């Protein structure tokens, strides 16, 4: 059976701090901020070609 | 991209490790004619035109008259 509100380990203050301070939103924000500081994948096409296997047609 | 030579085109695209300067003469194909290298001429007046490689399928009669 799904738990009621009273049988929860989190306090109301602890849960609602995550509510009004947007916790997991900031976590997902920090993910793509980490991605700002890494190496892109783009190759420059008429100067650099992508993969070739000999089987290609 | 069409201006790069065929044996080099496979190397720039990471098909072969050894460039066509450093391949042996065994992997050089033997030919009996000279090489030309036309890149691509689309829009240029030297574009390819297609045509019939063979003559029409059923011939007609070339007329000769006869004095009876």
Q: Using DSSP, state whether B62 is helix, strand or coil.
A: coil
Residue A55 at interface with chain B, using a CB cutoff of 8 Å:
no
Measuring CA to CA, how many Å separate B65 from each of B12, B58, B61, B62, B68?
68, 22, 12, 10, 9
To the nearest whole Å, the CA of B15 is away from the closest chain A CA by 5
Do residues B1 and A45 make contact, with C-beta atoms less than 8 angstroms apart? yes
To the nearest whole Å, the CA of B7 is away from the closest chain A CA by 12
To the nearest whole Å, the CA of B55 is away from the closest chain A CA by 32
CA within 13 Å, CB half, A30: 6
Measuring CA to CA, how many Å separate B10 from each of A46, A55, B40?
14, 12, 17
Tell me which chain A residue has its CA closest to the CA of residue B10.
A52
How far is the C-alpha of B63 from the C-alpha of B68, rounded, in Å?
16
* Given resolution (angstroms): 3.2
Tell me the technique behind this structure. cryo-EM
Residue A56 CA to chain centroid, in angstroms? Answer: 35
Q: Which residues contact A50 (CB under 8 A, 6 or more apart)?
A: A43, B13, B14
How far is the C-alpha of B21 from the C-alpha of B5, rounded, in Å?
12
Chains A, B: CB contacts within 8 A come to 18
Measuring CA to CA, how many Å separate B14 from each of A53, A54, B3, B8?
8, 10, 17, 10
Q: What is the largest CA-CA distance in chain A?
A: 65
How far is the C-alpha of A11 from the C-alpha of A20, rounded, in Å?
14
State the DSSP code for B35: -
């Amino acid at each position: 059976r799904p738990a009621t509100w009273e049988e929860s380990e989190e306090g109301a203050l602890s849960k609602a701090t995550k509510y009004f301070l947007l916790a997991e939103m900031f976590r997902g924000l920090y993910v793509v901020l980490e991605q700002f500081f890494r190496a892109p994948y783009t190759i420059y096409y008429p100067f650099e070609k992508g993969p070739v296997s000999p089987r290609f047609r | 991209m069409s201006q790069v030579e065929p044996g080099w085109h496979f190397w720039l695209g990471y098909g072969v490790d050894t460039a066509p300067c450093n391949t042996p003469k065994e992997k050089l194909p033997i030919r009996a004619y000279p090489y030309k290298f036309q890149p691509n001429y689309t829009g240029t007046p030297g574009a390819f035109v297609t045509y019939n490689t063979l003559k029409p399928k059923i011939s007609a009669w070339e007329p000769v008259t006869k004095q009876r």
